[PDB]
């Protein structure tokens, strides 16, 4: 025979498939995955600094101070924070909270508070703040009530108009709370403040509000018509709160220092704490991982690849395998 | 109501160790600051520390840090106060007494409302 | 340390005649609430001192009427009306703005005769 030379191109014994223009499933010699599929499924730590992980408690209940929630007095700085779906420990007492989602937004800019006490229960001799306790919101077997703010009542037959006001000294913000009871009937507001009409005034810098409480025939949610409504602000440097109020007035113990400020997120998960350490977290799991994408969840914090909703990205780099 | 009962009266030597106690009863014993006060005879009152027996976190002073430790259990609603090495110095009379119930780490640490009897510690040769 | 000082120390009152104990501090007790930081103690003759004033004015439960506390910030003052021999003993003002807490020297008080 005579001598003679070929020209071709690579085979090999690979699998990979890809996806065409034309065609799908086209096995090739080489292929790049640029998806991140898998998670350890751990909640982790981000950069060694652990979350706050409410377990059945809302951050309502954190932070007003829910009897039910009694590891979360005094928490560390966090760098992200877990609530479950439905945490049976929200409000105790039913009610309401204003502006709840700008407040779940503002704790993204937030990693740390401090506690303060700005108001002591002492302070409150012209009225008796023992009482205001509540049964399906127990303390120790007792009846009680959110830690962080003091139900008001009545003293001798008597409710005497209030005038307080803090001035913030600190040299950080302040997140402070407070609230009204709305009341379940006429009966129940003479029995508790001794007032038939009365109002409740809250004013900073900033803020000025004027509160009135509603009578209502309300369904009975724990065995309580009567609703309570608590609001919040922040309390800049040098700025004082001006409380003025002759019932109905929940007021403060307890505001909250804004000490750091930078990234974190608030994440629905029923998970709980795996004792491990990553650099990108989801409410499904950690993921560590290279990989410039992924399709664990759409929420994530940390140094993380970009969520897609696609179940396969595999980029073609080899020739067309044959056999 | 209130009621602040210690665990006097003791009598020891140089060198010995003692603990003595005071019991909390009539409210919640982890939810008030409690701590201990000192009066050596004839002399005014001196602050020792305070601890909150829900968490353990405790207030010492520049003082007596690290000189006497101070402790606290839930479970039977008792206060401690304790000594390695004891001195004659050391010889006066002990006070218990509630303080706050305040659960931040800054507050009205007052008011010292309910003191206890004392406890006589004699310390000589 | 917030350190307390007193005066008089020794104070000899006449059983019709009124009393005044005064009470300075190195630093503000005054908080940003409006209220003063401070308390007063009673100890009676081998008895364990007791809470008469707080916070700054307030009465203690079972304190008469003749007690009265008063003054802001730096200065403060217990005056009582009349004084018998019940109110004799060593009253102490102390401080409770900061850990650690700190007490006065002590006013010893005495009836006079």
């Known amino acids: 025979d005579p001598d003679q030379i070929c020209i071709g191109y690579h085979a090999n014994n690979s699998t990979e498939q890809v996806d065409t223009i034309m065609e799908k499933n086209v096995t090739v010699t080489h292929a790049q995955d640029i998806l991140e599929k898998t998670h350890n499924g751990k909640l982790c730590d981000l950069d060694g600094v652990k979350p706050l992980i409410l377990r059945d408690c809302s951050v309502a209940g954190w932070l007003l101070g829910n009897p039910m929630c009694d590891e979360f007095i005094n928490v560390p700085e966090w760098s992200y924070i877990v609530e479950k779906a439905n945490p049976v420990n929200d409000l105790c007492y039913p009610g309401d909270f204003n502006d709840y989602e700008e407040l779940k937004h503002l704790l993204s800019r937030i990693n740390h508070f401090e506690k303060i006490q700005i108001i002591p229960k002492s302070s409150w001799s012209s009225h008796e703040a023992s009482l205001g306790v509540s049964s399906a919101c127990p303390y120790q077997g007792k009846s009680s009530f959110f830690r962080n703010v003091v139900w008001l009542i009545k003293k001798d037959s008597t409710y005497p108009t209030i005038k307080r006001s803090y001035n913030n000294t600190n040299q950080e913000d302040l997140l402070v709370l407070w609230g009204i009871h709305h009341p379940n009937d006429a009966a129940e507001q003479t029995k508790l403040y001794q007032n038939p009409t009365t109002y409740i005034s809250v004013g900073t810098s900033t803020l000025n509000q004027r509160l009135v409480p509603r009578i209502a025939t309300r369904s009975k949610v724990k065995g309580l018509s009567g609703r309570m409504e608590f609001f919040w602000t922040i309390l800049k440097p040098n700025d004082a709160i001006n409380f003025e109020s002759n019932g109905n007035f929940i007021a403060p113990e307890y505001a909250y220092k804004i000490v750091k400020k930078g990234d974190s997120t608030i994440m629905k998960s029923e998970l709980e704490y795996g004792n491990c350490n990553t650099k990108c977290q989801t409410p499904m799991g950690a993921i560590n991982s290279s990989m410039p994408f992924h399709n664990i969840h759409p929420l994530t914090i940390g140094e993380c690849p970009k969520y897609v909703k696609s179940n396969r990205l595999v980029l073609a780099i080899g020739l067309r395998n044959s056999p | 109501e209130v009621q602040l009962v210690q665990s006097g009266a003791e009598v020891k030597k140089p060198g010995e160790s003692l603990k003595i106690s005071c019991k909390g009863s009539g409210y919640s014993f982890s939810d008030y600051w409690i701590g201990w006060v000192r009066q050596m005879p004839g002399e005014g009152l001196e602050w020792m520390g305070i601890?909150?027996?829900?968490?353990?976190?405790?207030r010492y002073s520049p003082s007596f840090q690290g000189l006497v430790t101070i402790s606290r259990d839930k479970s039977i609603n008792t206060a401690s106060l304790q000594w390695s090495s004891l001195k004659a110095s050391d010889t006066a009379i002990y006070y218990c007494?509630?303080?706050?119930?305040?659960?931040?780490?800054?507050?009205?640490?007052?008011?010292?409302?309910?003191w206890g009897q004392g406890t006589l510690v004699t310390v000589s040769s | 340390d917030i350190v307390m000082t007193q005066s008089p120390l020794s104070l000899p009152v006449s059983p019709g005649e009124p009393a005044s104990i005064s009470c300075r501090s190195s630093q503000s007790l005054l908080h940003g609430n409006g209220y003063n930081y401070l308390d007063w103690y009673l100890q009676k003759p081998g008895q364990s001192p007791r809470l008469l004033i707080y916070?700054?004015?307030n009465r203690a439960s079972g304190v008469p009427d003749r007690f009265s506390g008063s003054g802001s910030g730096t200065d403060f003052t217990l005056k009582i009306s009349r004084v018998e021999a019940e109110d004799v003993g060593v009253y102490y003002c102390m401080q409770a703005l900061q850990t650690p807490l700190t007490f006065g020297g002590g006013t010893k008080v005495e009836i006079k005769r």
């Open positions: 007494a509630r303080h706050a119930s305040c659960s931040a780490r800054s507050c009205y640490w007052g008011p010292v409302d309910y």
């Open positions: 916070l700054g004015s």
């Open positions: 601890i909150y027996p829900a968490s353990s976190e405790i």
